[PDB]
Amino acid sequence: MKQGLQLRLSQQLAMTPQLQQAIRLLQLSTLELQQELQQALESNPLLEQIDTH
């Protein structure tokens, strides 16, 4: 009956997707996966990788 942009309180049935997260890790090869892991290690102080030094 009308086409407008409004702010209102309604009761609606809502759908939403739930897939995309952590799926990018499957396609990556081992070398790119290690590079991404290094990038994650740099930003997160609580992540460490096993070393022999």
Binding site: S10, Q11, L13, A14, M15, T16
Partner: protein, 247 residues
Amino acid sequence: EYVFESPKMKEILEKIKKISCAECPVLITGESGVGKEVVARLIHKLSDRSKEPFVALNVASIPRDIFEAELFGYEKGAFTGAVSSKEGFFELADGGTLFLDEIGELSLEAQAKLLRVIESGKFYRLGGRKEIEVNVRILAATNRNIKELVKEGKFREDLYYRLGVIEIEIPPLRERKEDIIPLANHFLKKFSRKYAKEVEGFTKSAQELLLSYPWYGNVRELKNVIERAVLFSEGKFIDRGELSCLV
């Protein structure tokens, strides 16, 4: 108990007896308080499906954004917050009767969605995949002039002609004057016992005004007037003086 003491109403009752066996949708028509609910319940009672559930519904009380979800049901995960799978009204009343009061308030989208199931006879749940058969006897009622609605465009022509297989129109009470007197006494005995009043009948002068007043509310207005007269009057008989203010 109901009152059917007019030839125009007696032939309607005979048509009810000749229609109650059928399994096609019925559409009732009339003014306010003519007896559409009575007609629908008599149709359901006189049919073989009397023991089957009778679900009466008010289509104007169903929110738009969930309309179909209320009428066809939904499965698990159909929308966010769907914690279970609930059946619709077409599945609640299976083998019985579905009454849709005031069928004139549906939006065009609602009319199309209802007509789809009425024609095809099968529907899918909101989040489901399997199909469900109807096995539902559909009755509808309204007081609006459906011809004017379809001519204007507020009501779909296909839906009306699909529901128009059987049509029953109760005449207004102003055309059923011979039925006015039997109705009033029927109310008079009901309320007098209900309120412990000793009123037992009308006076001759009082009955004259009953047949002379145009009843805009039809039976409901007459019942209201009789209830007021019984509640307020405290004499053996109801006189025209008491009804003068009410009428």
